[PDB]
Design a protein around this ligand. Structure first.
Ligand SMILES: N[C@@H](CCC(=O)N[C@@H](CS)C(=O)NCC(=O)O)C(=O)O
Ligand SMILES: [Mg+2]
Ligand code: NA
Lengths: 145, 149
């Protein structure tokens, strides 16, 4: 077979509006919104009667996307947005930015919180884990040189 | 456009798994390639995660187009203490990564042959896509799609 591409990583959130704003602070652009109320969706997910509203975010380079999703029906029945770092399953998406200090300062001003501290790996890069919108874990890195 | 910054790219999405060997094998079947694999025990890693004294084995998978990556992590210490690998679809938090493949039927057939399970049906969306959700390695939710025309 052939793997054409990794289209996107989806994240289920409580507020699409708040999620969109947070990711726009990171640098992604809102690419579109859609009220998915079809019945085919339910057939894919195995939920059946399903209505979800999504907002697709895309990075400036056009290669990566984040699909923000809010369930209307059926309502959500669990939450792992603030699971610990040492937990099995999806952990975080990592973004490389030009200036990690300015990004940490701006995000934190808007409510985000560092999980560890900003760390330098040799002379190659700097990175950190931060909890952003709705406590969701996100990684940030800066390439040195 | 950000006055004092620039988003260069989304480097990767990472998944914490029980078996690095099995997870690597699974994503290889999906079509990603293994760039590297290593044990990381330097204290710097623990400062990032906030766990402190940690030892984790990491594996970096990259897509053929070279634009996307999946980082697989396995904790030696401290042990894991929570699991959302099999969280329901209608749950808050990271849900699934979606891959577009050449032939979804062959991929579904092959993956399920190796123990993966189709969540619902392989559905056709109008005249543009055919897609499904699959519980892959360790029940981890993945999305698959094939473009039509
Ligand atoms: N922008 C509206 C769009 C609502 C809507 O239903 N749009 C159509 C056209 S993009 C849609 O999403 N159809 C189903 C699909 O393409 O997934 C919103 O805020 O949800
Ligand atoms: Mg600097
Ligand atoms: Na759980």
């Amino acid at each position: 077979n052939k793997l054409l591409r990794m289209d996107n990583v989806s994240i289920v959130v409580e507020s699409l509006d708040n999620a969109i704003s947070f990711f726009e602070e990171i640098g992604l652009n809102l690419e579109g919104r859609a009220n998915v109320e079809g019945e085919w969706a339910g057939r894919v997910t195995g939920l059946g009667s399903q209505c979800v509203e999504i907002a697709m975010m895309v990075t400036p380079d056009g290669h990566s996307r984040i699909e923000l999703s809010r369930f209307l029906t059926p309502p959500t029945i669990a939450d792992h947005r603030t699971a610990p770092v040492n937990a099995l399953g999806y952990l975080r998406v990592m973004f490389t930015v030009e200036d990690i200090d300015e990004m940490v300062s701006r995000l934190t001003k808007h409510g985000a919180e560092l999980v560890g501290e900003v760390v330098q790996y040799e002379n190659s890069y700097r990175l950190c884990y931060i909890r952003g919108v709705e406590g969701i874990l996100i990684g940030l890195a800066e390439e040195l040189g």
